[PDB]
Amino acid sequence: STAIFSDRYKGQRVLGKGSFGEVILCKDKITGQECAVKVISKRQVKQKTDKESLLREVQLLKQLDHPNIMKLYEFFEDKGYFYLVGEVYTGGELFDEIISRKRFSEVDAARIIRQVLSGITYMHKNKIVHRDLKPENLLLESKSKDANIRIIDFGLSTHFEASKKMKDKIGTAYYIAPEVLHGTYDEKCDVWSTGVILYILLSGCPPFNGANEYDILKKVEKGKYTFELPQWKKVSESAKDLIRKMLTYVPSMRISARDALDHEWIQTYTKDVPSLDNAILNIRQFQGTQKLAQAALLYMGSKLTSQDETKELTAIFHKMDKNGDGQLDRAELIEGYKELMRMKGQDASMLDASAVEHEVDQVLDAVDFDKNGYIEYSEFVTVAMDRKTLLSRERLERAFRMFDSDNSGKISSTELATIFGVSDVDSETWKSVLSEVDKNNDGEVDFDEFQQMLLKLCGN
Numbered sequence: 001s002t003a004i005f006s007d008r009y010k011g012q013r014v015l016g017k018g019s020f021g022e023v024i025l026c027k028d029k030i031t032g033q034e035c036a037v038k039v040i041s042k043r044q045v046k047q048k049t050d051k052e053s054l055l056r057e058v059q060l061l062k063q064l065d066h067p068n069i070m071k072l073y074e075f076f077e078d079k080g081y082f083y084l085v086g087e088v089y090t091g092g093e094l095f096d097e098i099i100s101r102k103r104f105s106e107v108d109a110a111r112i113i114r115q116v117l118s119g120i121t122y123m124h125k126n127k128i129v130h131r132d133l134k135p136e137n138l139l140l141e142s143k144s145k146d147a148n149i150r151i152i153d154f155g156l157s158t159h160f161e162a163s164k165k166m167k168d169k170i171g172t173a174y175y176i177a178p179e180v181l182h183g184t185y186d187e188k189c190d191v192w193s194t195g196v197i198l199y200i201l202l203s204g205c206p207p208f209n210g211a212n213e214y215d216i217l218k219k220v221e222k223g224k225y226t227f228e229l230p231q232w233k234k235v236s237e238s239a240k241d242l243i244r245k246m247l248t249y250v251p252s253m254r255i256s257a258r259d260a261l262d263h264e265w266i267q268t269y270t271k272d273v274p275s276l277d278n279a280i281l282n283i284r285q286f287q288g289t290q291k292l293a294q295a296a297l298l299y300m301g302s303k304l305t306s307q308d309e310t311k312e313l314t315a316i317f318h319k320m321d322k323n324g325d326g327q328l329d330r331a332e333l334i335e336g337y338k339e340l341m342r343m344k345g346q347d348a349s350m351l352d353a354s355a356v357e358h359e360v361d362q363v364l365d366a367v368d369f370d371k372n373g374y375i376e377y378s379e380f381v382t383v384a385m386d387r388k389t390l391l392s393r394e395r396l397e398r399a400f401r402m403f404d405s406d407n408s409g410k411i412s413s414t415e416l417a418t419i420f421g422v423s424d425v426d427s428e429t430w431k432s433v434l435s436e437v438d439k440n441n442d443g444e445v446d447f448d449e450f451q452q453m454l455l456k457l458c459g460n
């Protein structure tokens, strides 16, 4: 009688890893409506509150409505997962659209920040705090150029513990309010994060920066920042005054979301403004660096998952092969692949039996052999996993290219230091690894070299 997610929805495709879980594009089996489902693994994420409190929050968020906040439609739960079913948005992340623009002025910044403050104000009225507000939580509603910003992930932080794994942690330290670090926080922390994002939109650099996560956290905690850089000369006084008010240390003296909406800067500039060319270049650099460290971490992770899943799948099938001749049929292959999912959460794309039948067919319709006869599972295993190895190898490659804006084919030692600082790989550890692959003292690596470093940084 309790509703089953897969009874209602089929998976179309994965949309990536978000905070607390993967997101999958799904479709209602009856009505045909498309949805973006965030699937949270119960094993991998400790809850902060009881079930009663989670349920009550979900019920509230189902009834909330605001143009700058993601719409939530449905909530499911079974033995291992939460399924959070929201509206699909196709505009991508705000910053990925900002990097691909000729001009960007304070008028562009003010319109974006007004949308963010508007969504935030509304949620604070409803006593919902974000805590983790950052640029990848700002999606554009569509590919249209006038598109509304939809803030994602309101509600989650209250109920779920943040990951301390670096794959999940990257990019977060720049944005977290000081009082979150120390444990006594309330809705003002969201003004702080919004202040950091605005600082970044108008200069291209984080106001609190450092060589690794803990050095960023130290800057945040002392709370000092300056507008002394060159690009701050191209910016109105009123913009810096707002930022000062939003990055006020003691939360009770910090400006509220609502009072920020009535600020001179927002009033004036969301109604003869020079472009901010110097900020577009730095944000393009900043985004590129952030995106490649993520891809570096996700690539290392999927290689670790592959090692785990390759050995496990082989063992499962050996048990199944009773006669010991290596011959299993598609139905057994499906049963073996299902069992791998029975004890693993990395394929949130494999939501049910029919997602797995199709995925076996795809592997099978590559290995060439017939799916109505018996099969050599050894072969099947070696192709199934690579459809994540090659798949992930290609996603790293693209971010390497994206990062290499001069198409030089290479990343300097200085740039590696920056990528590995953001990735929290120890300086001595990656230099050590660099030495084992770059024996010419070029002080630069090409893609395959950079890839070899990462395999050596995840025990290969």
Ligand SMILES: CCOc1ccc2cc(-c3nn(C[C@H](C(C)C)N(C)C)c4ncnc(N)c34)ccc2c1
Residues within 6 Å of the ligand: 015, 016, 017, 018, 019, 023, 036, 037, 038, 061, 070, 072, 084, 085, 086, 087, 088, 089, 090, 092, 093, 139, 152, 153, 154, 155, 156
């Ligand atoms: C209470 C929070 O419940 C939800 C439900 C669905 C969610 C869906 C997304 C989401 N994530 N993504 C993919 C994004 C990015 C590619 C835009 N990242 C996380 C891989 C989306 N793309 C389009 N529309 C969406 N709604 C999303 C993010 C947070 C969500 C939170």
